[PDB]
Amino acid sequence: MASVERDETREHRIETEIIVDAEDKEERAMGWYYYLDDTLEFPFMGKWKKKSRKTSTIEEKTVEVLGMAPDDECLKDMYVEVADIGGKDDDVYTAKLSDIEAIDVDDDTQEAIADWLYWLARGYKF
Ligand SMILES: [Ca+2]
Ligand SMILES: [Ca+2]
Numbered sequence: 001m002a003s004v005e006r007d008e009t010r011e012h013r014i015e016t017e018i019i020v021d022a023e024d025k026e027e028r029a030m031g032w033y034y035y036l037d038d039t040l041e042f043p044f045m046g047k048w049k050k051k052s053r054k055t056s057t058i059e060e061k062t063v064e065v066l067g068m069a070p071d072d073e074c075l076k077d078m079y080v081e082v083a084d085i086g087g088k089d090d091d092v093y094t095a096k097l098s099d100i101e102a103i104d105v106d107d108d109t110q111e112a113i114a115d116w117l118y119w120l121a122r123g124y125k126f
Contacts, residue, residue, distance in 0.1 A: 004118035019125075026075055028126030032116075033074035036097070039112040042067045044105045046113075048082055048095045062086050065102070069094050078116060 005011070022031040048061045062085045069079035078097035083089070098120045102113050119125075 001123060002118075002121040004121045010115065010118070025126050029075045029077075030071070032078060032119075032126075033068065033071060036078060036112050036116065037068045040068070040109045041106055042109075044102050044109055045085070046082075046100045046102045046105075048099060049101055050095070050099050062103075063095070063100075065100060066092065068097075 018035045019028055019031040022028045042065060044065050046063055046065045048063045049058045050061060052059045063082040064085055066081040068074060069081055073079045079094050080097050080100055081092055082095045083092045097116055102110050
């Protein structure tokens with residue numbers, strides 16, 4: 001639980017659109033995956049604020065975000081394909097959406113990310 005709520009409007013829009021028929025874990029994951037992709041307008045630039053290896057601290061890296069991972073990944077958690085801008089600029093990886101923040105993106109893309117970060121802080125429902 002966390003108080004990451006402007007009002008119960010978010011909970012009701014999750015309930016009446018994203019997960020309305022979903023409660024089996026695969027459906028919960030797919031409901032989130034479908035509406036998050038559709039809201040996000042990839043490609044976009046972001047910071048991979050990777051949870052550190054040392055502690056609950058952050059090891060940031062600057063990345064280009066190509067798209068959400070396959071549905072085969074997105075059954076377990078929200079994930080995104082990413083390419084390192086910092087040095088490689090020629091190779092690709094995958095990151096949790098839970099460890100990404102967008103940079104200079106449109107409002108709808110940024111809202112999907114912020115809303116997912118609220119769900120992350122809330123402690124999930126699947
Ligand atoms: Ca069901
Ligand atoms: Ca889309």
